[PDB]
Amino acid sequence: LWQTWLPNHVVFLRLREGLKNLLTRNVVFGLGGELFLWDGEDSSFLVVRLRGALSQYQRLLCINPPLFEIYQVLLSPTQHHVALIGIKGLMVLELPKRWGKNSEFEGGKSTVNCSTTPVAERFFTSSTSLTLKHAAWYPSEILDPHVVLLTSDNVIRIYSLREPQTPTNVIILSGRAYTASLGETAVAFDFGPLAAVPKTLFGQNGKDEVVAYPLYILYENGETFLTYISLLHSPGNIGKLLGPLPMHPAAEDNYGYDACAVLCLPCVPNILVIATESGMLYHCVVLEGLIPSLYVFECVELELALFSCPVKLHRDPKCPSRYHCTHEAGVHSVGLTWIHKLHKFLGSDEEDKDSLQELSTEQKCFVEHILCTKPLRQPAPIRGFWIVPDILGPTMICITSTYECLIWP
Amino acid sequence: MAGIILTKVGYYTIPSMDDLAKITNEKGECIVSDFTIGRKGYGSIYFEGDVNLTNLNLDDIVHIRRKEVVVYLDDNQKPPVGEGLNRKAEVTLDGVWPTDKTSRCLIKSPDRLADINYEGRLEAVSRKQGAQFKEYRPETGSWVFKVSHF
């Protein structure tokens, strides 16, 4: 079983020896029965076959490598492309084809060249100080791959791989100056699940229902915005941005500032997880309004479940009610056992808020510190996190700052 | 006027533009100590010590907005540190209040601002930009902070 021998595979020795020679890091992704590990020093992927030896791996080389550091790697919805995400750029790698009885890339050659294409290359060279804050794929598994980029200019741009230098859609959310509104800028976003929406939502007609995905956008000051995206029917310049979503109930501390991460759990009504650098996790029910609102069902303080570090949120492939949190102290698992009690009809009127409040007094989420990376001297964040989905029990892979491969359970 | 240009509505100087004219000497040089330039209702910039305002286009150099201020629009047309208006200064921005995430109203109550320690938030917002927080006045939302230069 790979859960036993994977921590001893030579790829981790290779990566570890590469150390001796900001975005949160995730240098690993899984596909099929294979694990992909980004080797920054060689600008290539190390591919280990988990299903079907400690020295065997394939190296997937970038024909044209990125010169900026890769912080995160992200497999596309159709699983034919990988986004190579850095602070100073984004590059998309096309995976090669497989063949042979073992379904190895290009028949099991030790080394395979992969085509790459830079994205939005103009914006990162023209404006030297322009940085990438967050990136993800448009969730569709049917359309051409589209990447979604949030840059430090507080603008979101969508690019087709067919025209990687020209946005298909722009979302203006609205440093030379001294400013007090330093937190009125987006730090992250996340797509919600597929939804059918009236075509009238995008200005067209027919009373017909079209595919769209809700896009939730998080400001540093904790404010949240919402817009629905349809690559076919959305305008080139999207202006129907809803928010800031009112956050209920009123909190004495106004839910603070310094929000750093957002996650939309795949449920209806949508539920947002908002994380802060201080370790606060807010679980927010999105209540339909035309502006929806948020009901903070509960809050979790990770500082108590063990703190001024960036927090990264991960969905669970099996259960919409569970997610995971990675930080300098390790990994927390959070189970929202109350998700299944919320019905699809919920609304934003007063009686619904009172029912949610009453329900929150008899329901609590389950939080567990499953992996501890705390040192003996300076704590270091993990470099990789992946949940291998097996129906017989999810296996979690966590790559430490020194490229140790921790496996849980 | 002997050199200085300031015409944008709402802007002013202490001493006034008229006073600066009379301060100009025989050879046409306007040197003043503790000079202030402000925009009524939005903020002001206090320059302690002597500064040479001779032939400065304050309309093009100084920009005061709500919760924001700019001095010299681009770095190329900026003098070195210590010369011109690119020097130590005390900035005051008015109408600086946080927004209630529930009601979406501005929080102006001193007790409410002490509850959420908005003062400590402004101290952090100052350091992150290379400034030193000095004080905050709730009644007018006046955020005062010192900068080493612009």
Domain residue ranges in chain A? 1-119+380-409, 253-372
Residues 6+ apart with CB under 8 A from A314: A263, A323, A324, A325, A326, A385, A387
A203: alpha, beta or left? (left if phi > 0; alpha if psi -120 to 50): left
CA-based diameter of chain B, in Å? Answer: 61
Render the burial of B74-96: b for 16+ CB within 10 Å, e for the rest: eeeebeeeeebbbbebbbbbbbb
- The answer to whether the Cβ–Cβ distance between B116 and A253 falls below 8 Å is yes
- Closest to A140 (Cα-Cα) out of A91, A92, A78: A78
**A350 contacts chain B (CB < 8 A):** no
- What is the rounded CA–CA span in Å between residue A400 and residue A51? 23
**A182 contacts chain B (CB < 8 A):** yes
CA-based diameter of chain A, in Å? Answer: 65
**B98 contacts chain A (CB < 8 A):** yes
**How far does Cα B117 stand from its chain's mean position?**
24
**B76 contacts chain A (CB < 8 A):** no
- Closest to A337 (Cα-Cα) out of A289, A298, A379: A298
Q: Name the token pair of B35.
A: 């000079």
The number of CA neighbours under 13 Å toward the Cβ of B18 is 0
Phi, psi of A12 (to 5 degrees): -75, -35
- Closest to A135 (Cα-Cα) out of A119, A115, A114: A119
Distance between B25 CA and the closest CA of chain A, angstroms: 34
Identity at B133, one-letter amino acid code: F
- Closest to B118 (Cα-Cα) out of A85, A254, A208: A254
> Is the CA virtual torsion A382, A387, A393, A395 positive or negative?
negative
- The answer to whether the Cβ–Cβ distance between A254 and B101 falls below 8 Å is yes
**B67 contacts chain A (CB < 8 A):** yes
- What is the rounded CA–CA span in Å between residue A286 and residue A264? 10
- Closest to A400 (Cα-Cα) out of A325, A331, A319, A320: A331
Strand partners, A151: A132, A155
- What is the rounded CA–CA span in Å between residue A164 and residue A310? 30
Edge-to-edge strands, sheet with A178-179: A178-179, B68-71, B62-65
- What is the rounded CA–CA span in Å between residue B15 and residue B83? 20
Identity at A212, one-letter amino acid code: A
Distance between A295 CA and the closest CA of chain B, angstroms: 10
Within B9-97, residue ranges assigned H as helices are 17-23, 58-61
> Is the CA virtual torsion A200, A202, A208, A209 positive or negative?
negative
- What is the rounded CA–CA span in Å between residue A322 and residue A314? 9
Option in A176, A179, A246 nearest B67 (CB)? A179
In B, minimum Cα distance to A255 occurs at B101
The number of CA neighbours under 13 Å toward the Cβ of A325 is 34
- Closest to B143 (Cα-Cα) out of B91, B105, B98: B91
* CB atoms closer than 10 angstroms to residue A166: 11
- What is the rounded CA–CA span in Å between residue B93 and residue B145? 9
- Closest to A45 (Cα-Cα) out of A81, A90, A5: A81
Q: Is the Cβ–Cβ distance between A46 and A55 less than 8 Å? A: no
Contacts of A177 in chain B (CB under 8 A): 63, 65, 68-70
* A-contacting residues in B 32-61 (Cβ below 8 Å): none
- What is the rounded CA–CA span in Å between residue B69 and residue A301? 36
Distance between A152 CA and the closest CA of chain B, angstroms: 16
Which burial class, exposed, middle or buried, applies to A190 when counting CB atoms under 10 A from its CB (0-12, 13-18, 19+)? buried
- Closest to A186 (Cα-Cα) out of A236, A233, A132, A145: A132
Instruction: With H, G, I as helix, E, B as strand and everything else as coil, classify residue B109.
Output: coil
Contacts of A183 in chain B (CB under 8 A): 125
- What is the rounded CA–CA span in Å between residue A91 and residue A82? 8
Instruction: With H, G, I as helix, E, B as strand and everything else as coil, classify residue A280.
Output: strand
In A, minimum Cα distance to B132 occurs at A178
Contacts of A176 in chain B (CB under 8 A): 70, 73-74
| Residue of B44, B75, B90, B101 to mutate for A, most A C-beta atoms under 10 A | B101
- The answer to whether the Cβ–Cβ distance between A177 and B69 falls below 8 Å is yes
Distance between B108 CA and the closest CA of chain A, angstroms: 13
- The answer to whether the Cβ–Cβ distance between B125 and A176 falls below 8 Å is no
Identify the H or E element spanning A121: helix A121-126
Contacts of B148 in chain A (CB under 8 A): none
- What is the rounded CA–CA span in Å between residue B115 and residue B94? 21
Strand partners, A347: A288
**B131 contacts chain A (CB < 8 A):** yes
Residues 6+ apart with CB under 8 A from A44: A38, A59, A60, A61, A62, A65
- Closest to A97 (Cα-Cα) out of A84, A79, A119: A79
- What is the rounded CA–CA span in Å between residue A94 and residue A80? 6
Strand partners, B147: B89, B131
Q: Name the token pair of A328.
A: 């300098």
- What is the rounded CA–CA span in Å between residue B82 and residue A31? 59
Render the burial of A222-259: b for 16+ CB within 10 Å, e for the rest: bbbbbbbbbbebbeeebeebbbbbbbbeebeebbbbbb
The number of CA neighbours under 13 Å toward the Cβ of A220 is 14
Phi, psi of A141 (to 5 degrees): -100, 5
